[PDB]
Amino acid sequence: MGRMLTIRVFKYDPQSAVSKPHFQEYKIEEAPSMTIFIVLNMIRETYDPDLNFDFVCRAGICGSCGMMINGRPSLACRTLTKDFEDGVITLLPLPAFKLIKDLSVDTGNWFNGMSQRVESWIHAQKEHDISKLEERIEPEVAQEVFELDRCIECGCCIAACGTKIMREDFVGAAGLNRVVRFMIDPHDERTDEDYYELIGDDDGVFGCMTLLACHDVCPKNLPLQSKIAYLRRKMVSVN
């Protein structure tokens, strides 16, 4: 508040032949409840309309604004400048994703491919009649499926993962969590063996080095640590 903030932003246009990666600094006056969302829009409308970034809900619910904020993958719309003592904030695009420009990366299409790779949809032999009563489900089970279904595909756990940064084909924490989400859903008939055919290799669960950065950075606080281990124990004893 009244405090002068130093915002350092990574800039680079891979589609421009004359663009070189560099940092650009901006000087903005802090205001109460100020978020990175507000900071970037101020810069856009009054200092530099060139800068690329992606915002949608600005309510921490859509997973669009992930970026490296002072070294940590976080949702820019829920990040308060107030929490940075130095008054110096450095913004980098999320690593491990294809860069579009500056702070904008292609997060959506990687997740879509991931969703297809683990076949992120209900697998059932028969199609239930939608004009009849729903199949009953224990409220406890519906609750635990929901917990894992809360993933907003923000990509923070992917960018946070040193393994994924070194090894591109790694399915990532988000992928391992998606598998478990269906594993514990009674509507899905796949067996442990079916899941093994999906992530039972070095690009899957066995490629995880348990760095746990995914768990410690998940803005949704999903139980990644225990859920991934759960999956590892399960996959290691398939055949």
């Binding site: 409308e45 690329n52 949809w121 004009s131 729903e134």
Partner: protein, 655 residues
Amino acid sequence: MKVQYCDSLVIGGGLAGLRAAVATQQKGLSTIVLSLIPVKRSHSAAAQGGMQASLGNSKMSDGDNEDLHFMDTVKGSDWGCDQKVARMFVNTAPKAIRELAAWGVPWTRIHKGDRMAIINAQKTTITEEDFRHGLIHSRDFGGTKKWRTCYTADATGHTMLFAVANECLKLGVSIQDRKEAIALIHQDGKCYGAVVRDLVTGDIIAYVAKGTLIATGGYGRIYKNTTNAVVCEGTGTAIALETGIAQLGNMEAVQFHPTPLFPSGILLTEGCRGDGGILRDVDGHRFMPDYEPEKKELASRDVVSRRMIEHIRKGKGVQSPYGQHLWLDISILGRKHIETNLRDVQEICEYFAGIDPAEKWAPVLPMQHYSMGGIRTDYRGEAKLKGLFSAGEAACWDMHGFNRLGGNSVSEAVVAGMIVGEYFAEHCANTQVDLETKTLEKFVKGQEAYMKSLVESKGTEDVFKIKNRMKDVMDDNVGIFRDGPHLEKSVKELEELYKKSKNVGIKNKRLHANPELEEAYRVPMMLKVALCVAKGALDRTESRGAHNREDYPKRDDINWLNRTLASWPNPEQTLPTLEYEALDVNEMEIAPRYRGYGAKGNYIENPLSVKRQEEIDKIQSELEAAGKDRHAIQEALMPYELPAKYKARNERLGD
């Protein structure tokens, strides 16, 4: 030239667009879904209240059916909706919930036992029998007597959107994000596709299809204060308008929400899950009981918004750098029991408002929330432009009239996706189109030239201040309370704003990944949408649903029992052309009367309403005497259409 072809083109990756894509793709029609952003980030993902559907599972849902849901919808619409469309909706909602359940949506379920509170007064303990255990639960939302709002804990829109998007991936629907439809290709009154701009590369591409469906959401962002995502700017509405043939319906019908966080607009679902939130003014005074002695804070959200504005104009509002607001106090709770999930709102306030709800009060002010208005279609979802369909908030299918029922909009998105999806598929499979390269090239090169002129423009106007000026005008003059004098001035300034938008100049000259270029062509579009809303509001001299004219406080069923149709025939005109579509009282199952909320006897009665009412009363009493069921009586009062796939009845607990 670059051309992409598909049998069914869907513009918009929200619940409506994705569900429609499933309908077409499942029948072998090649389909493409275009979206500004990855589809799972659409505004639909923000829905936390729930979805309305008459399942009749829980104790508080007992005895619920299509008729009761239909009544709430019609009366809520303040008789501005197409009642037949509402029937198609309520009858199909139950099956939408159930289909999503089969698709994995983790709906909160009912468990045997007793629950406390969650009631205005009197009773306070609810008992769920054993035969209800395991079925889809429901909560109190939207103010309906019967609790029928289904939910997946606190992220209903999110789980629903993800399931429908996953189904699209399963079927191999072609999802192309960061792609924007900037114009519709049409000839001889027929739509053959859209001209698309690749937001990343800047390429202008023609997407041709036998049928095109627009499910682009609302246009809340023309207002400064809104709960809508940053992408709900109404460009889908605009490109439809710019064809000079497709028409927009009831653009002036905008709904506000009483308690979004001020000034962010972030939704605080406070006072929902468990009634307790208390509204206070600048003196800490609980004012709602002063205006609504009986209902108090639990009055109709429609009423709460008005009272909040009234109280502020009475000089009892809180001053701040961003304007005036009021207070929302939930600390009066800050604790309870357990046995289920109940903890979220605090985080919203801490992460953004920077405070603990259980301690300090949250600043709030009514803000734009939903867009009843949209592209005008028939009951099948087809616009006046043949081959162009629309579904969801982007449409004016019109099951909402002048006031959407809480929980009905996320429900319409999926339901319309199912129904319009069927008609859209049928159209795409049966129609035959003549794709002329001469016409394709005209539209494509026309947009390329347009992009070039924007980048080369030596104009001195600043696109951002013009867009911000527009949002202020809309908020100040086209809000909860409106009057001719101010609407007159806003329309005038908007028109002036529109002319200046054409003299904009931008700094960044590149054609690819250019945020500034994006605003340069989107703002003029938003201004045309704003003009339709403002002008529609000025010419509508009556008060109906969410549209309140202080100079015409009554609902006029004699001169305004109709729908506003906006068009833009001459690409050079600066004001929309408005026409009216009258609502036939004889084609109504429920004649106009008291809407059920707000002041009593506040509407000019139409002689025909009384005539039709008597006929209804008569037709019912008779058939009821002959021992005819509600299904036969409904059909005798107002028959409606439904595609084969969904004309089955909905089984309920205890049939």
